[PDB]
Design a protein around this ligand. Structure first.
Ligand SMILES: CSC[C@H]1O[C@@H](n2cnc3c(N)ncnc32)[C@H](O)[C@@H]1O
Ligand SMILES: CSC[C@H]1O[C@@H](n2cnc3c(N)ncnc32)[C@H](O)[C@@H]1O
Ligand SMILES: CSC[C@H]1O[C@@H](n2cnc3c(N)ncnc32)[C@H](O)[C@@H]1O
Lengths: 274, 274, 274
């Protein structure tokens, strides 16, 4: 079934850019690639090129120009396409709100947990039968990659919070005050966004080593002015150079393979399929 | 694209009637209007007429005869149609359950917050791309209208609770005891219903001044007999005259425009669109 | 509309088998039956036969061979088909995780409450209009049947926990640690599974006496190794003989009708329809 145009393209690391991150810059020797999927179009062309001898595939989850809101993303096509290229590692870069004073706008967070409060994403899996698949996601992120992101941040002198629970909401509207109080005071979540689920579910089912590098862009409803879309975008674009510096530091060190014992999803299917 | 039959019809105030409220009574000079929408049919004909020189559009959200349950309402068509008529203010009248002893059957509530626990409403926005829109809904109701409803209630001698958090559930079944304990004791919500979301989301995106006048019809699972549909309908029909008296008091005072500084959604799109 | 092949088949008790329970064994005089529904195919053929003079209909909710995951089950077709055969009682057998130390793998639980945390089941009711139906589900299980299951377990010498709140999650992935902490410590649920909703909703709307016999197969994320699909299936298959012994004990005593005063859904429609 699988066809790419141009043919024969492969990559080792995938980067899924979120808010503010619509192009890479600069993969060398870039090529725009069309990757067939059983689910139709990924968000945009995938750009494949080289970073210090490592082949990287970049996909803007919202499309170039931020054309696709969180609820309308073809998550299945995006992850299928990256898997079809041969990627082993996936770095997601995302904008998040903070539910705690000490996670400040401009700080990075490398989450370790999530809570799914989405509702309208239509498909939360690749496996609709006849092989029933129930992956374990107790520890949903790839720890090998998490630790490499934290190390890079520290080496560059950036603040990187080493843990966090991400509450994923449906959107596109932001939370009410009453909702935000539930997330913060009842669920004791740390950060909030709209795009993690079902991206992470699908990455795990695909046996990828996936981790999120989140940038705090706002304090949700808790600052004297509530979050707006314009604020999020401005803070992300202001800080995108720091995100790029982290990526160009991390990627050369991903030439090898994830360590199985620090990659919860890397053999996910072995015990998950009935 | 926009066509009405008859042509040329406009209105200033919209009223969305809930349980028990299927006709107005009596807009003068009433006309039934068909309003084209990109989403198909609204719940029913919209009835447009005059109340003390203010043009009012009435829409029964469940259709005449209560034909459309909460999960099957074409929320996008309903709000598009009201916007297309030129309305600035939208009064929703709704039946709710109470999660607290002091919010008693027969009392009105003018909520200020909500928590969305729906799942199956299919579209929670008008904006699916390519313009991505994330409206702020920290304070989701229009405060100008809330205060006018409270003032009218007080002037008429009715009990009107001046705040409340509405938990919106999916339905159509009512809550289990275990669910109701979560709403009451964990989320600390005050009232419960099925129709607020995504109606309110869409109204905000449409830059309307929307507020809910809720009538408590029951105590959910917490009275010696649990809520039934027959009970809700009976209590609403018993009290509909009081709701009508409030409307005929409020509407003449809506001849002007919402105050921007007391209308959180009136310029929602200015900072929400990417 | 209603056609069966072969024609004329009727049954009194339905059994909906979950994980590990794909065939009965041994209804005498078994026949595989096709039952037309307005919703298309049930999960598999329904097998009808006799158990000590009581006519029983068995339906594997996942299909033979566990071909259909929880989110892909045609719940409406399954319950319509059982109702069309004339069943009055429905015993569901299900695998669940435990959120409490004392509900141990191998123990049975007869839940009394549930919390619905699903999102993607598409239809949560039979009633989409023009008759609006809102069933009361404060006490969602049929108490007559619950008590008969508990009595059978005790008579056979098995551990059967006499109450429990079932949290139904969407899946197919298992919960994260952060999610499981919400279920356990915030919602104070006892057991967790994926298939109860909307099966139970539909059974109640169909005026069936429905109860769940759950078998604890795992402790979710809380044991030194998190739950896997292979573990659940193995524990269920190891214990399926005990589930069969309970069924063959209970079924002969269901020759009569549910007691109305101990069957919350048996006249559900009387007060639910508008
Ligand atoms: C560009 S504005 C929209 C983006 O903001 C992200 N995000 C940032 N702050 C928040 C917040 N407070 N709540 C929800 N999502 C947020 C979401 O993942 C979404 O794609
Ligand atoms: C006419 S019965 C159905 C209506 O009852 C309203 N409602 C009243 N009481 C409750 C309650 N306790 N829980 C949920 N919705 C309720 C819902 O919004 C729905 O449209
Ligand atoms: C055969 S593995 C999948 C089945 O496990 C059941 N189940 C058992 N343990 C759990 C658990 N911890 N969480 C969710 N569902 C579970 C679900 O209802 C599902 O159909």
């Amino acid at each position: 079934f699988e066809i790419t145009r141009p043919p024969g393209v492969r990559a080792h690391v995938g980067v899924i850019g979120g808010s503010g991150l619509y192009d890479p810059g600069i993969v060398e020797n870039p090529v725009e690639v069309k990757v067939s999927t059983p689910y139709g179009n990924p968000s945009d062309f995938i750009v494949v090129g080289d970073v210090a001898g490592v082949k990287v595939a970049f996909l803007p989850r919202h499309g170039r120009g931020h054309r696709i809101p969180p609820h309308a993303i073809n998550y299945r096509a995006n992850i299928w396409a990256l898997k079809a290229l041969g990627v082993k590692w996936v770095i997601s870069v995302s904008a998040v709100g903070s539910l705690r004073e000490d996670y400040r706008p401009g700080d990075f967070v490398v989450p370790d947990q999530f809570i799914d409060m989405t509702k309208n994403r239509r498909h939360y899996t690749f496996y609709d039968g006849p092989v029933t698949v129930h992956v374990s996601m107790a520890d949903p992120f790839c720890e090998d990659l998490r630790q490499r992101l934290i190390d890079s941040g520290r080496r560059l002198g950036y603040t990187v919070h080493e843990r966090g629970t991400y509450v994923c909401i449906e959107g596109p509207r932001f939370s009410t005050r009453a909702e935000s109080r539930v997330w913060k005071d009842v669920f004791k979540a740390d950060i909030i966004g709209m795009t993690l689920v079902p991206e992470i579910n699908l990455a795990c089912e695909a046996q990828l080593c996936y981790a999120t590098l989140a940038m705090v862009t706002d304090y949700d409803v808790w600052a004297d002015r509530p979050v707006t879309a314009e604020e999020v975008e401005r803070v992300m674009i202001s800080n995108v150079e720091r995100a790029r510096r982290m990526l160009y530091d991390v990627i050369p060190k991903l030439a090898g393979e994830p360590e199985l014992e620090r990659c919860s999803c890397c053999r996910a299917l072995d015990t998950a399929a009935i």
